[PDB]
Tab-separated table of N, CA and C in Angstrom:
chain	number	residue	atom	x	y	z
F	1	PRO	N	0.821	-1.205	0.000
F	1	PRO	CA	0.000	0.000	0.000
F	1	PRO	C	0.856	1.256	0.000
F	2	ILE	N	0.309	2.358	-0.489
F	2	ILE	CA	0.987	3.643	-0.367
F	2	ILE	C	0.276	4.417	0.730
F	3	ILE	N	1.043	4.813	1.743
F	3	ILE	CA	0.520	5.472	2.932
F	3	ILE	C	1.297	6.750	3.212
F	4	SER	N	0.812	7.530	4.164
F	4	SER	CA	1.536	8.696	4.638
F	4	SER	C	2.557	8.321	5.713
F	5	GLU	N	3.809	8.723	5.510
F	5	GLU	CA	4.851	8.572	6.524
F	5	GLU	C	5.717	9.821	6.474
F	6	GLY	N	5.880	10.488	7.607
F	6	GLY	CA	6.488	11.805	7.560
F	6	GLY	C	5.636	12.732	6.702
F	7	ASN	N	6.292	13.582	5.922
F	7	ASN	CA	5.544	14.545	5.121
F	7	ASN	C	5.235	14.062	3.710
F	8	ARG	N	5.369	12.765	3.456
F	8	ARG	CA	5.235	12.263	2.092
F	8	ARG	C	4.533	10.924	2.026
F	9	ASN	N	4.337	10.444	0.802
F	9	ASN	CA	3.847	9.098	0.551
F	9	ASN	C	4.988	8.097	0.608
F	10	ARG	N	4.700	6.899	1.098
F	10	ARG	CA	5.707	5.851	1.150
F	10	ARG	C	5.058	4.480	0.982
F	11	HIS	N	5.799	3.528	0.414
F	11	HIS	CA	5.304	2.168	0.334
F	11	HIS	C	5.426	1.439	1.682
F	12	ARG	N	4.393	0.656	1.993
F	12	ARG	CA	4.267	-0.144	3.205
F	12	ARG	C	3.685	-1.485	2.761
F	13	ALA	N	4.313	-2.594	3.137
F	13	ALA	CA	3.850	-3.899	2.664
F	13	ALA	C	2.452	-4.195	3.193
F	14	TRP	N	1.674	-4.930	2.400
F	14	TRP	CA	0.346	-5.384	2.807
F	14	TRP	C	0.372	-5.911	4.228
F	15	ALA	N	-0.624	-5.546	5.024
F	15	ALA	CA	-0.816	-6.197	6.313
F	15	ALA	C	-1.560	-7.511	6.104
F	16	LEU	N	-1.236	-8.496	6.934
F	16	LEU	CA	-1.887	-9.797	6.894
F	16	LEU	C	-3.412	-9.661	6.823
F	17	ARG	N	-3.981	-8.813	7.677
F	17	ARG	CA	-5.435	-8.663	7.745
F	17	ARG	C	-6.033	-8.084	6.462
F	18	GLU	N	-5.302	-7.182	5.813
F	18	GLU	CA	-5.763	-6.584	4.566
F	18	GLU	C	-5.933	-7.649	3.487
F	19	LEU	N	-4.929	-8.514	3.362
F	19	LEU	CA	-4.966	-9.589	2.378
F	19	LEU	C	-6.091	-10.571	2.667
F	20	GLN	N	-6.219	-10.973	3.924
F	20	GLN	CA	-7.271	-11.908	4.313
F	20	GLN	C	-8.664	-11.347	4.060
F	21	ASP	N	-8.856	-10.060	4.331
F	21	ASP	CA	-10.157	-9.435	4.115
F	21	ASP	C	-10.542	-9.463	2.649
F	22	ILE	N	-9.603	-9.126	1.773
F	22	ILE	CA	-9.896	-9.154	0.349
F	22	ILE	C	-10.145	-10.584	-0.121
F	23	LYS	N	-9.288	-11.506	0.305
F	23	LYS	CA	-9.390	-12.907	-0.098
F	23	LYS	C	-10.759	-13.492	0.276
F	24	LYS	N	-11.201	-13.239	1.505
F	24	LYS	CA	-12.473	-13.788	1.980
F	24	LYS	C	-13.665	-13.174	1.253
F	25	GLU	N	-13.581	-11.882	0.968
F	25	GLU	CA	-14.660	-11.189	0.273
F	25	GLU	C	-14.823	-11.678	-1.168
F	26	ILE	N	-13.707	-11.859	-1.870
F	26	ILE	CA	-13.742	-12.060	-3.310
F	26	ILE	C	-13.722	-13.543	-3.722
F	27	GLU	N	-13.545	-14.440	-2.747
F	27	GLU	CA	-13.378	-15.883	-3.000
F	27	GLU	C	-14.509	-16.520	-3.829
F	28	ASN	N	-15.722	-15.985	-3.725
F	28	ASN	CA	-16.854	-16.560	-4.438
F	28	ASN	C	-17.276	-15.690	-5.615
F	29	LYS	N	-16.356	-14.874	-6.123
F	29	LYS	CA	-16.662	-14.001	-7.260
F	29	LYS	C	-15.893	-14.444	-8.493
F	30	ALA	N	-16.559	-14.474	-9.644
F	30	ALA	CA	-15.896	-14.916	-10.869
F	30	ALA	C	-14.889	-13.891	-11.363
F	31	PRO	N	-13.645	-14.322	-11.653
F	31	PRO	CA	-12.678	-13.367	-12.204
F	31	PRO	C	-13.188	-12.689	-13.469
F	32	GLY	N	-13.092	-11.365	-13.519
F	32	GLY	CA	-13.547	-10.608	-14.671
F	32	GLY	C	-14.975	-10.117	-14.577
F	33	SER	N	-15.735	-10.672	-13.637
F	33	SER	CA	-17.105	-10.230	-13.440
F	33	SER	C	-17.119	-8.788	-12.939
F	34	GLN	N	-18.258	-8.128	-13.093
F	34	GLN	CA	-18.397	-6.762	-12.602
F	34	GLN	C	-18.149	-6.681	-11.095
F	35	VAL	N	-18.661	-7.659	-10.351
F	35	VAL	CA	-18.519	-7.645	-8.898
F	35	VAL	C	-17.054	-7.896	-8.494
F	36	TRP	N	-16.368	-8.789	-9.210
F	36	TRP	CA	-14.927	-8.976	-9.031
F	36	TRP	C	-14.193	-7.644	-9.185
F	37	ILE	N	-14.477	-6.938	-10.274
F	37	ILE	CA	-13.778	-5.699	-10.577
F	37	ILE	C	-14.105	-4.619	-9.537
F	38	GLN	N	-15.374	-4.468	-9.146
F	38	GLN	CA	-15.704	-3.463	-8.131
F	38	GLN	C	-15.137	-3.797	-6.740
F	39	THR	N	-15.008	-5.081	-6.426
F	39	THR	CA	-14.372	-5.481	-5.166
F	39	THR	C	-12.921	-5.030	-5.138
F	40	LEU	N	-12.224	-5.254	-6.248
F	40	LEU	CA	-10.828	-4.864	-6.348
F	40	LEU	C	-10.690	-3.335	-6.442
F	41	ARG	N	-11.647	-2.659	-7.071
F	41	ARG	CA	-11.615	-1.201	-7.079
F	41	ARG	C	-11.705	-0.646	-5.652
F	42	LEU	N	-12.527	-1.274	-4.819
F	42	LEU	CA	-12.607	-0.877	-3.419
F	42	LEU	C	-11.250	-1.061	-2.730
F	43	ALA	N	-10.616	-2.216	-2.927
F	43	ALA	CA	-9.304	-2.458	-2.334
F	43	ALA	C	-8.278	-1.421	-2.803
F	44	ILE	N	-8.345	-1.067	-4.083
F	44	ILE	CA	-7.410	-0.107	-4.665
F	44	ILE	C	-7.603	1.277	-4.050
F	45	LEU	N	-8.855	1.681	-3.858
F	45	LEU	CA	-9.148	2.959	-3.214
F	45	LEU	C	-8.668	2.976	-1.762
F	46	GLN	N	-8.823	1.854	-1.069
F	46	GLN	CA	-8.396	1.750	0.332
F	46	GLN	C	-6.875	1.807	0.505
F	47	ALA	N	-6.161	1.098	-0.368
F	47	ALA	CA	-4.750	0.802	-0.148
F	47	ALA	C	-3.785	1.558	-1.059
F	48	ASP	N	-4.286	2.099	-2.167
F	48	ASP	CA	-3.427	2.670	-3.214
F	48	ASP	C	-2.247	1.752	-3.524
F	49	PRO	N	-2.533	0.513	-3.951
F	49	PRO	CA	-1.470	-0.478	-4.133
F	49	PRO	C	-0.619	-0.223	-5.374
F	50	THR	N	0.665	-0.522	-5.241
F	50	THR	CA	1.609	-0.468	-6.339
F	50	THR	C	1.465	-1.692	-7.243
F	51	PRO	N	2.159	-1.703	-8.392
F	51	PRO	CA	2.108	-2.927	-9.207
F	51	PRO	C	2.574	-4.174	-8.446
F	52	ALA	N	3.626	-4.056	-7.639
F	52	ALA	CA	4.085	-5.197	-6.862
F	52	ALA	C	3.018	-5.632	-5.866
F	53	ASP	N	2.374	-4.671	-5.213
F	53	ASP	CA	1.280	-4.991	-4.301
F	53	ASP	C	0.191	-5.791	-4.994
F	54	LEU	N	-0.167	-5.374	-6.208
F	54	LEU	CA	-1.247	-6.034	-6.928
F	54	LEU	C	-0.845	-7.449	-7.337
F	55	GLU	N	0.412	-7.630	-7.736
F	55	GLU	CA	0.936	-8.959	-8.043
F	55	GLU	C	0.855	-9.877	-6.824
F	56	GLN	N	1.272	-9.358	-5.671
F	56	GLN	CA	1.210	-10.126	-4.431
F	56	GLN	C	-0.215	-10.549	-4.113
F	57	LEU	N	-1.153	-9.623	-4.264
F	57	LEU	CA	-2.560	-9.908	-4.012
F	57	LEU	C	-3.084	-11.039	-4.914
F	58	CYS	N	-2.672	-11.032	-6.177
F	58	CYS	CA	-3.109	-12.081	-7.106
F	58	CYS	C	-2.798	-13.492	-6.639
F	59	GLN	N	-1.720	-13.667	-5.885
F	59	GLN	CA	-1.346	-15.009	-5.439
F	59	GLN	C	-2.404	-15.607	-4.512
F	60	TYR	N	-3.165	-14.744	-3.831
F	60	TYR	CA	-4.218	-15.198	-2.922
F	60	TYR	C	-5.525	-15.498	-3.636
F	61	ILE	N	-5.790	-14.789	-4.730
F	61	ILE	CA	-7.156	-14.746	-5.264
F	61	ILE	C	-7.327	-15.217	-6.709
F	62	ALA	N	-6.236	-15.447	-7.430
F	62	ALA	CA	-6.362	-15.778	-8.844
F	62	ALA	C	-5.520	-16.973	-9.236
F	63	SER	N	-6.110	-17.878	-10.007
F	63	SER	CA	-5.386	-19.046	-10.508
F	63	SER	C	-4.221	-18.623	-11.399
F	64	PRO	N	-3.192	-19.464	-11.495
F	64	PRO	CA	-2.101	-19.145	-12.418
F	64	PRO	C	-2.576	-18.903	-13.857
F	65	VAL	N	-3.525	-19.700	-14.351
F	65	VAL	CA	-4.013	-19.514	-15.712
F	65	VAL	C	-4.645	-18.125	-15.867
F	66	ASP	N	-5.424	-17.705	-14.875
F	66	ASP	CA	-6.035	-16.382	-14.941
F	66	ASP	C	-5.020	-15.256	-14.744
F	67	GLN	N	-4.060	-15.437	-13.841
F	67	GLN	CA	-3.017	-14.426	-13.661
F	67	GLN	C	-2.243	-14.178	-14.940
F	68	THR	N	-1.854	-15.263	-15.603
F	68	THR	CA	-1.017	-15.156	-16.782
F	68	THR	C	-1.779	-14.433	-17.891
F	69	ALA	N	-3.035	-14.814	-18.094
F	69	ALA	CA	-3.850	-14.169	-19.110
F	69	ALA	C	-4.078	-12.701	-18.775
F	70	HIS	N	-4.322	-12.412	-17.502
F	70	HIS	CA	-4.544	-11.049	-17.068
F	70	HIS	C	-3.320	-10.180	-17.347
F	71	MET	N	-2.140	-10.687	-17.013
F	71	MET	CA	-0.935	-9.883	-17.169
F	71	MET	C	-0.604	-9.689	-18.644
F	72	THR	N	-0.849	-10.707	-19.461
F	72	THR	CA	-0.648	-10.575	-20.893
F	72	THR	C	-1.555	-9.482	-21.464
F	73	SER	N	-2.812	-9.462	-21.041
F	73	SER	CA	-3.736	-8.429	-21.470
F	73	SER	C	-3.312	-7.049	-20.977
F	74	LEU	N	-2.938	-6.959	-19.705
F	74	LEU	CA	-2.534	-5.689	-19.120
F	74	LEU	C	-1.303	-5.105	-19.815
F	75	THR	N	-0.302	-5.941	-20.040
F	75	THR	CA	0.912	-5.520	-20.715
F	75	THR	C	0.598	-4.944	-22.095
F	76	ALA	N	-0.322	-5.583	-22.803
F	76	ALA	CA	-0.738	-5.092	-24.113
F	76	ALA	C	-1.520	-3.794	-24.021
F	77	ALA	N	-2.379	-3.673	-23.009
F	77	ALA	CA	-3.163	-2.453	-22.829
F	77	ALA	C	-2.257	-1.268	-22.526
F	78	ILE	N	-1.211	-1.507	-21.742
F	78	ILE	CA	-0.253	-0.457	-21.428
F	78	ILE	C	0.527	-0.052	-22.688
F	79	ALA	N	0.974	-1.037	-23.463
F	79	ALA	CA	1.686	-0.761	-24.705
F	79	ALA	C	0.786	0.003	-25.672
F	80	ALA	N	-0.467	-0.429	-25.786
F	80	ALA	CA	-1.391	0.188	-26.730
F	80	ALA	C	-1.736	1.619	-26.327
F	81	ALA	N	-1.910	1.851	-25.032
F	81	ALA	CA	-2.247	3.177	-24.531
F	81	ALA	C	-1.111	4.165	-24.791
F	82	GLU	N	0.133	3.714	-24.665
F	82	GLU	CA	1.256	4.585	-24.965
F	82	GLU	C	1.284	4.966	-26.441
F	83	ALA	N	1.189	3.970	-27.311
F	83	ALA	CA	1.278	4.213	-28.748
F	83	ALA	C	0.100	5.031	-29.267
F	84	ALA	N	-1.078	4.832	-28.674
F	84	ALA	CA	-2.291	5.526	-29.100
F	84	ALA	C	-2.433	6.873	-28.400
F	85	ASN	N	-1.472	7.174	-27.529
F	85	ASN	CA	-1.391	8.453	-26.825
F	85	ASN	C	-2.605	8.729	-25.931
F	86	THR	N	-2.912	7.778	-25.065
F	86	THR	CA	-3.981	7.967	-24.087
F	86	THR	C	-3.475	7.958	-22.642
F	87	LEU	N	-2.167	7.799	-22.443
F	87	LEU	CA	-1.586	7.896	-21.101
F	87	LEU	C	-1.225	9.329	-20.776
F	88	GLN	N	-1.820	9.865	-19.717
F	88	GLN	CA	-1.578	11.240	-19.317
F	88	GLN	C	-0.362	11.336	-18.406
F	89	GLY	N	0.510	12.292	-18.687
F	89	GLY	CA	1.650	12.555	-17.825
F	89	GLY	C	2.722	11.492	-17.876
F	90	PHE	N	2.726	10.699	-18.941
F	90	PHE	CA	3.633	9.564	-19.034
F	90	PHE	C	4.713	9.760	-20.089
F	91	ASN	N	5.965	9.832	-19.645
F	91	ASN	CA	7.075	9.885	-20.582
F	91	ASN	C	7.834	8.580	-20.450
F	92	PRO	N	7.781	7.752	-21.495
F	92	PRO	CA	8.391	6.421	-21.408
F	92	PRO	C	9.906	6.464	-21.303
F	93	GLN	N	10.504	7.619	-21.573
F	93	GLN	CA	11.948	7.745	-21.416
F	93	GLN	C	12.362	7.688	-19.941
F	94	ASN	N	11.386	7.814	-19.037
F	94	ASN	CA	11.641	7.744	-17.596
F	94	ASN	C	11.343	6.362	-17.023
F	95	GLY	N	11.105	5.392	-17.897
F	95	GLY	CA	10.816	4.032	-17.466
F	95	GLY	C	9.418	3.622	-17.880
F	96	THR	N	9.093	2.345	-17.721
F	96	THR	CA	7.765	1.870	-18.077
F	96	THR	C	6.696	2.405	-17.128
F	97	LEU	N	5.432	2.267	-17.515
F	97	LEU	CA	4.344	2.666	-16.634
F	97	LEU	C	4.433	1.868	-15.335
F	98	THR	N	4.757	0.577	-15.435
F	98	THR	CA	4.915	-0.277	-14.263
F	98	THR	C	6.024	0.251	-13.349
F	99	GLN	N	7.179	0.587	-13.922
F	99	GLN	CA	8.262	1.135	-13.109
F	99	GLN	C	7.897	2.451	-12.457
F	100	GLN	N	7.365	3.388	-13.234
F	100	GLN	CA	7.064	4.707	-12.686
F	100	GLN	C	5.939	4.667	-11.642
F	101	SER	N	4.985	3.750	-11.801
F	101	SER	CA	3.843	3.662	-10.884
F	101	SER	C	4.220	3.143	-9.490
F	102	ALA	N	5.417	2.590	-9.355
F	102	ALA	CA	5.913	2.129	-8.060
F	102	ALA	C	6.347	3.297	-7.182
F	103	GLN	N	6.652	4.435	-7.792
F	103	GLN	CA	7.068	5.597	-7.013
F	103	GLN	C	5.909	6.122	-6.167
F	104	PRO	N	6.079	6.168	-4.830
F	104	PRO	CA	4.950	6.569	-3.979
F	104	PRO	C	4.293	7.904	-4.363
F	105	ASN	N	5.068	8.865	-4.855
F	105	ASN	CA	4.510	10.171	-5.190
F	105	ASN	C	3.948	10.239	-6.606
F	106	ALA	N	4.018	9.129	-7.334
F	106	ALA	CA	3.516	9.105	-8.705
F	106	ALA	C	2.062	8.632	-8.777
F	107	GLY	N	1.207	9.233	-7.954
F	107	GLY	CA	-0.184	8.822	-7.865
F	107	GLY	C	-0.974	8.947	-9.154
F	108	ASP	N	-0.680	9.965	-9.950
F	108	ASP	CA	-1.431	10.172	-11.183
F	108	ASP	C	-1.152	9.071	-12.200
F	109	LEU	N	0.100	8.638	-12.277
F	109	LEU	CA	0.433	7.520	-13.149
F	109	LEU	C	-0.091	6.204	-12.585
F	110	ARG	N	0.085	6.005	-11.283
F	110	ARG	CA	-0.325	4.749	-10.673
F	110	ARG	C	-1.838	4.547	-10.762
F	111	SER	N	-2.598	5.637	-10.671
F	111	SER	CA	-4.051	5.560	-10.811
F	111	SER	C	-4.421	4.991	-12.181
F	112	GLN	N	-3.708	5.428	-13.214
F	112	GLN	CA	-3.935	4.914	-14.564
F	112	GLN	C	-3.536	3.440	-14.678
F	113	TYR	N	-2.412	3.077	-14.074
F	113	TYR	CA	-2.020	1.672	-14.004
F	113	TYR	C	-3.120	0.849	-13.350
F	114	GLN	N	-3.603	1.335	-12.210
F	114	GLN	CA	-4.620	0.627	-11.442
F	114	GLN	C	-5.882	0.403	-12.264
F	115	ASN	N	-6.316	1.422	-12.995
F	115	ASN	CA	-7.502	1.266	-13.824
F	115	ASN	C	-7.293	0.272	-14.968
F	116	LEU	N	-6.129	0.311	-15.610
F	116	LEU	CA	-5.824	-0.666	-16.651
F	116	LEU	C	-5.757	-2.084	-16.070
F	117	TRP	N	-5.181	-2.204	-14.874
F	117	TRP	CA	-5.102	-3.479	-14.182
F	117	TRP	C	-6.505	-4.048	-13.926
F	118	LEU	N	-7.437	-3.186	-13.510
F	118	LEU	CA	-8.827	-3.602	-13.311
F	118	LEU	C	-9.472	-4.064	-14.608
F	119	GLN	N	-9.346	-3.246	-15.645
F	119	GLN	CA	-10.000	-3.534	-16.918
F	119	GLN	C	-9.468	-4.798	-17.585
F	120	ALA	N	-8.197	-5.108	-17.342
F	120	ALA	CA	-7.570	-6.282	-17.924
F	120	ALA	C	-8.180	-7.598	-17.444
F	121	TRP	N	-8.955	-7.577	-16.359
F	121	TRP	CA	-9.655	-8.794	-15.936
F	121	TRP	C	-10.844	-9.125	-16.835
F	122	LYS	N	-11.316	-8.166	-17.631
F	122	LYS	CA	-12.401	-8.452	-18.568
F	122	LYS	C	-11.899	-9.289	-19.739
F	123	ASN	N	-12.823	-10.004	-20.370
F	123	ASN	CA	-12.522	-10.893	-21.491
F	123	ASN	C	-11.266	-11.765	-21.350
F	124	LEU	N	-11.110	-12.414	-20.197
F	124	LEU	CA	-10.141	-13.503	-20.059
F	124	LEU	C	-10.463	-14.517	-21.158
F	125	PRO	N	-9.473	-15.314	-21.592
F	125	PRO	CA	-9.761	-16.193	-22.734
F	125	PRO	C	-10.910	-17.157	-22.465
F	126	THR	N	-11.715	-17.429	-23.488
F	126	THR	CA	-12.783	-18.424	-23.379
F	126	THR	C	-12.958	-19.192	-24.680
F	127	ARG	N	-13.420	-20.436	-24.546
F	127	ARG	CA	-13.700	-21.338	-25.666
F	127	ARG	C	-12.558	-21.420	-26.672
C-alpha cells in the first residue's frame, strides 16, 4: 500500500489482515465479473497499491491460468495506450508505466495503471 509517513507518501507492505479481508470477500466471485472488478476497485481505493502490491494480491485470489492471461492483457493495454497516446503525464523515457507507478509520489500515473489493471480482468480467454 501507499501510505503517509512523515511529510510524504511511502510504500508499506500489505498487512496480513488486509490480504485476508480481500481474499475472503472475493473468493466466491468470478474473475472478470463486474462484482470482481468493483471489489478490487474498493481495495485499490483503500490501499493505493503499487504494481508489486497487486501482483502479491493475485497469489491469494487468482489461478495461475487467470493471472497469466490477465498480465498478458494488461501488458498489451499499457503498450497500446502509450502508442495511441492515451496515457496522461507519461514519458516512457523515464521508465515503463509499471516502473514509474511504483514511485509513492507518482499517484497520477499509478491511478492509470490501477484502472488498466482492473480492466484487464475483462474478457479472459474463453472457448
